[PDB]
Amino acid sequence: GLPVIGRVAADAPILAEQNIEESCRINPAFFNPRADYLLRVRGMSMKDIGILDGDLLAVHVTREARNGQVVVARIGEEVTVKRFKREGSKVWLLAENPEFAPIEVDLKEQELIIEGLSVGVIRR
């Protein structure tokens, strides 16, 4: 199965037991690459690629992201779902909804952790 993560505690691994709201019986290998957890998406910042408020993002754990990838990012202690774009020592977390400005991260002043790579979505 796959854990469903609703809240993300500060300064703790995302896959910590205390973050798990419930469980889904779907096999991890349903997705490719294999999913490690499902994360509830909040808001409509990614609606133009069909990821809507309340969807569950299937997430493959990785700490490195490549330009163009849809990633889960922790900026400070806030978790967001955004498209990744790195400009040298700058990172852009791009929304897929013209109503939301790109979030700029200066890797020198702000902590950024990539929590993983989107490998799918479950909508219910």
Q: Evaluate whether 25 touches 1 at the Cβ level (below 8 Å).
A: yes
Query: At closest approach, how far in Å is the CB of 24 from a copy of itself?
Result: 6
List of residues contacting Ca ion (CB under 5 A): 11
Pick one of 30, 78, 87, 104: the residue that binds a copy of itself (CB under 8 A): 30
43-72: b (≥16 Cβ within 10 Å) or e: ebbbbeeebeeebbbbbbbbeebeeeebbb
What mask, x for binding a copy of itself by CB under 8 A, covers residues 37 to 76?
----------x--xxx--x--x------------------
Between residues 40 and 98, which has the closer beta carbon with respect to Ca ion?
A: 40
